Amino acid sequence: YGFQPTNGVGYQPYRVVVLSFELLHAPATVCGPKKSTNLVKNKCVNFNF
Amino acid sequence: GYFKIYSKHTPINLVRDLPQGFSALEPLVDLPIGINITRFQTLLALHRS
Numbered sequence: 001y002g003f004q005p006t007n008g009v010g011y012q013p014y015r016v017v018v019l020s021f022e023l024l025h026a027p028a029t030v031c032g033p034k035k036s037t038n039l040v041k042n043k044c045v046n047f048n049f
Numbered sequence: 050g051y052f053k054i055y056s057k058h059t060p061i062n063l064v065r066d067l068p069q070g071f072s073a074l075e076p077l078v079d080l081p082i083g084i085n086i087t088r089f090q091t092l093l094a095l096h097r098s
């Protein structure tokens with residue numbers, strides 16, 4: 001590619017990243033995130049620890 | 050796929066014989082490898098000086 005700055009769109013360089021999630025047969029690995037809330041002590045309030 | 054390691058460091062009042070007594074071992078590490086294992090060895094520091 002001889003890229004030049006005065007090229008019409010569709011001839012200018014694009015950078016590409018291809019993420020490929022694979023699942024072999026291990027026990028686990030990476031994963032999404034998990035925010036953390038607060039803790040209100042003294043009050044029958046549902047909880048997850 | 051997890052390789053667990055428990056350990057304990059007790060002080061003997063001997064040098065190199067297996068003593069008697071009770072001492073429970075506390076978990077140290079956890080490695081999500083996936084590795085298969087069938088054999089193992091040891092490593093020693095030679096005599097040169």
Ligand SMILES: *[C@@H]1O[C@H](CO)[C@@H](O)[C@H](O)[C@H]1NC(C)=O
Nearest residue numbers: 025026050082083084085086
């Ligand atoms: C470990 O070796 C056994 C051999 O019987 C094989 O079937 C198994 O797939 C191996 N473990 C993994 C995680 O591939």
